[PDB]
Each structure stands twice: as structure tokens, then as C-alpha cells.
């Protein structure tokens, strides 16, 4: 049987993207720039804070000094950090808490494989810290998803090979990273978005220990 499950945060455990989008939209509103909507925001995922700000400024050809740029990046982050103070156990996706309990009770290791720079805080706010054996630090990852590095790191941080692990992801890049690490992917979403060559469930209520064991046995 598999020995570990490697979780992404966003789109699996919780909607982590939303508060970043909110904070960017608020910043843009404050300075009179229109166009920070959800399709635009897809262009900010995985992008640095400063490169993200520059994209927003570019929507209006808005010119700013280095000092004003620094203030704006700071303000968005301040607002974001304020917003995430309100994260709670209610922000946990359906099925995930029970899955975590069942994995733990079966002595299956649990690791986070997320780019989130606020992963540990967010798991604390959701009261999930005690279920996690390790969190892979994204600051120590040389290459982001779809590179496998962060999944390999998450497996290693719990003392297993990725080949002993299942990875859970909602993104095409994350599924590729899981494949390339040697772990077994189980996607959440649509085959239209994630491909027809992996096991996919339509939402996180389908991620149960019994389903993961079935999948493992049938691979």
C-alpha cells in the first residue's frame, strides 16, 4: 500500500488563490486601474509579487517611482495578510478533514507540496497542523511545478520515496509534477483540464481513504 499522500494546498485543501486575487483587486481599485478580473489573475499565479504588480500597472501604462512601487507591493501584501487572519476550519474543502483523520489513523504519512509562502500559517488557521508530518518549504525548491522538485521534497521530508506516494492536485502543472516525481497522481476536476490518462475525481468529497487504496491497487 502507499506510505504517504502529498497534498497541494490551493484547490485541494482550500481556496488559497481567492484572498490573493481579492488583495490585488483592492489595490487596483485604490489606484484607479480597471481590468483585474479572474482571467487576468490567472496571469499572476506562480508569478512574483513584484512581477504581478508590474502586470497590473501595465494594464493602464501607469508609471511609478521605485519608492511608490515598493509602497504598493507592501500594501497589497499587508491587505492579504490581514485578510488571511479570518481563515478558519470552515475554509477546508469537503472530504479533506476526514481523509486526513483516516490517513493518520492508518499511519500513512501526510505532507504539503505547495508553493504557498503562507502554508504553515494557513494550516494552523484551519486547525490542520497536527495532521501534517511535514511541509515542503517552497523557498528551498529550485524549480516550480510542473517540475517535480516540490513533490520529491515533500516525500523526502517524511522519509519516503515518491514512488511510495500518492499526490493530490487540481492543476495540469501539478499533475505533471506528481507524474515526474514518481508518485501516483489523482486529480480533482475535469478530464478536459487535466487529461484522460490519470484518475480524476470531480470534487474533493471523492478523495476518501477507500478510494485512494482502490486506485493504488489498480495502478
**Could you tell me the maximum CA-CA distance found in the chain, to the nearest angstrom?**
59
Nearest to 20 by CA among 70, 63, 80, 95: 80
| Residues forming the site for Mg ion (CB under 5 A) | 8, 10-11, 170-171
14/27 with CB nearer Mg ion: 14
Which positions make up the binding site for Mg(2+)?
Answer: 8, 10, 170
Q: Closest distance between Mg ion and the C-beta of residue 6, in Å?
A: 12
Q: Closest distance between Mg ion and the C-beta of residue 189, in Å?
A: 10
The distance of Cα 137 from the centroid of its chain, to the nearest Å, equals 12
Which positions make up the binding site?
Answer: 8, 10, 46-47, 49, 116-118, 170
Q: Closest distance between Mg ion and the C-beta of residue 87, in Å?
A: 16
149/170 with CB nearer Mg ion: 170
Pairing of strands 199-201, 184-188: parallel
**Stated length of the chain:** 219
41/171 with CB nearer Mg ion: 171
Which positions make up the binding site for beta-D-glucose 6-phosphate?
Answer: 10, 46-47, 49, 116-118
Contacts of residue 207, Cβ cutoff 8 Å, sequence gap at least 6: 95, 96, 99, 168, 186, 188, 201
Give per-residue burial for 121-143: e unless 16+ CB within 10 Å, then b. ebbebbebeebbbbbbebeebee
The distance of Cα 48 from the centroid of its chain, to the nearest Å, equals 15
Q: Closest distance between Mg ion and the C-beta of residue 66, in Å?
A: 33
28/169 with CB nearer Mg ion: 169
Q: List, by residue number, the catalytic residues.
A: 8, 10
Query: Which residue shows C-alpha cell 513584484?
Result: 50
Amino acid at each position: 500500500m502507499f506510505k504517504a499522500v502529498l497534498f497541494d494546498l490551493d484547490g485541494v485543501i482550500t481556496d488559497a488563490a481567492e484572498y490573493h486575487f481579492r488583495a490585488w483587486k483592492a489595490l487596483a481599485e485604490e489606484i484607479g486601474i480597471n481590468g483585474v478580473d479572474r482571467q487576468f489573475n490567472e496571469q499572476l499565479k506562480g508569478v512574483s509579487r513584484e512581477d504581478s504588480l508590474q502586470k497590473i500597472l501595465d494594464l493602464a501604462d501607469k508609471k511609478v517611482s521605485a519608492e511608490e512601487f515598493k509602497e504598493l507591493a507592501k500594501r497589497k501584501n499587508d491587505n492579504y495578510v490581514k485578510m488571511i487572519q479570518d481563515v478558519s476550519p470552515a475554509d477546508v474543502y469537503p472530504g479533506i478533514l476526514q481523509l486526513l483523520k483516516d490517513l493518520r489513523s492508518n499511519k500513512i504519512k501526510i505532507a504539503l507540496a505547495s508553493a504557498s509562502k503562507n502554508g504553515p500559517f494557513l494550516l494552523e488557521r484551519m486547525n490542520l497542523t497536527g495532521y501534517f508530518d511535514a511541509i515542503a518549504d517552497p523557498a528551498e525548491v529550485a524549480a516550480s511545478k510542473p517540475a517535480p522538485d516540490i513533490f520529491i521534497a515533500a516525500a523526502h521530508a517524511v522519509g519516503v520515496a515518491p514512488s511510495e506516494s500518492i499526490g493530490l492536485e487540481d492543476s495540469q502543472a501539478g499533475i505533471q509534477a506528481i507524474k515526474d516525481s514518481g508518485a501516483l497522481p489523482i486529480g480533482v476536476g475535469r478530464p478536459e483540464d487535466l487529461g484522460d490518462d490519470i484518475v480524476i475525481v470531480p470534487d474533493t468529497s471523492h478523495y476518501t481513504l477507500e478510494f485512494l487504496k482502490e486506485v493504488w491497487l489498480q495502478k
